[PDB]
Design a protein that fits this description.
By secondary structure, the chain is α+β, with helices and mostly antiparallel strands. The chain has one domain (about 1-250): 3-Layer(aba) Sandwich (Beta-lactamase). Helix content is about 35%, strand content about 20%. The two termini are about 20 Å apart. The relative contact order is 0.19. The protein binds (2S,5R)-1-formyl-5-[(sulfooxy)amino]piperidine-2-carboxamide (NXL) and ligand FYG. (2S,5R)-1-formyl-5-[(sulfooxy)amino]piperidine-2-carboxamide binds near residues 142 and 196. It is classed as hydrolase/inhibitor. Keywords: antibiotic resistance, mutant, Gram-positive, inhibitor, hydrolase, HYDROLASE-INHIBITOR complex. It forms a monomeric assembly.
């Protein structure tokens, strides 16, 4: 059933929530239900879905696929090269995913998000939050018009990885490959993606870790989310919290 749980010890004083769902036995474990139901920008967690869009549309084809780096200078060393899908995903390389999505027409993206029930499915601000001054390093998924709740993230993850969408199984497997995480515990498989943004209206972070976990037959889909007012709280910090929860309660 739906169990309300207390994972606050693992959050070590940071404000947030968590939801874990096992769809075989319909076990919903929820910490901070209000937050779990609140829609926010997905930030870089949207790269999970953008990857599948690019694969389905043929813009990319494998974890080796490239997007034609043009020499633009970036402060992240690893963005300055013709990187593969696998490396762009793990580096959260914004230029790679912006070029990818701008090869896809807006109607196709709208219909895919509608089919996935991806939050408000609002792509109206296609080029993103331009008032932050970052120009082409912006898009509808980065503190802009698209918003989704942690509950809805888990529901989307489950539909994708349980095979209930029309995405090709080959493409799902590419995603699984590039999302795998090493947590120094061979008895569980963890997959996920971080995201980091700052909600300027509410003066709160949107710090995310969303993904799935396999252990001994069972699979849990999960979303961990902070909304702290402390700007030091990032996606990577929230991934730490998620792994602590997994090791304590799901091992
Ligand atoms: C992903 O979450 N990223 C972090 C950061 N997001 O900030 S934004 O929502 O204001 O755009 C920049 C994009 C991306 C990254 N790691 O570059
Ligand atoms: N970012 C990760 O993947 C985290 C961080 C370090 C390793 C891998 N992993 C863990 O869970 N670790 O910690 S450890 O279990 O204490 O060795």
């Amino acid at each position: 059933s739906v169990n309300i749980v207390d994972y606050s010890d693992c959050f070590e004083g940071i404000s947030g929530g968590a939801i874990f769902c096992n769809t075989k036995n319909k076990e919903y474990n929820i910490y901070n239900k209000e937050l779990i139901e609140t829609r926010r920008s997905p930030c870089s967690t949207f790269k999970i879905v953008s990857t599948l869009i690019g694969l389905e549309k043929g813009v990319i084809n494998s974890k080796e696929s490239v997007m034609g780096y043009d020499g633009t200078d970036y402060p992240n060393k690893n963005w300055n090269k013709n990187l593969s899908l696998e490396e762009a995903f793990k580096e959260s390389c914004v230029w790679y995913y912006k070029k990818l999505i701008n090869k896809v027409d807006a109607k196709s993206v709208q219909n895919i998000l509608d089919d996935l029930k991806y939050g408000n499915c609002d792509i109206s601000e296609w080029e993103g939050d331009l008032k932050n001054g970052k120009g082409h390093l912006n898009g509808f998924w980065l503190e802009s018009s698209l918003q989704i709740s942690p509950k809805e993230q888990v529901q989307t993850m489950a539909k994708i990885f349980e095979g209930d969408t029309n995405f090709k199984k080959e493409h799902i497997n590419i995603l699984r490959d590039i999302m795998a995480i090493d947590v120094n515990d061979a008895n569980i498989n963890v997959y996920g993606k971080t995201g980091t943004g700052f909600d300027e209206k509410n003066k709160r972070v949107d710090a995310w870790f969303v993904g799935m976990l396999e252990r001994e037959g069972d699979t849990y889909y999960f979303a961990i989310k902070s909304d702290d007012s402390n700007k030091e709280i990032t996606g990577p910090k929230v991934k730490e919290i998620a792994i602590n929860i997994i090791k304590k309660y799901y091992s």
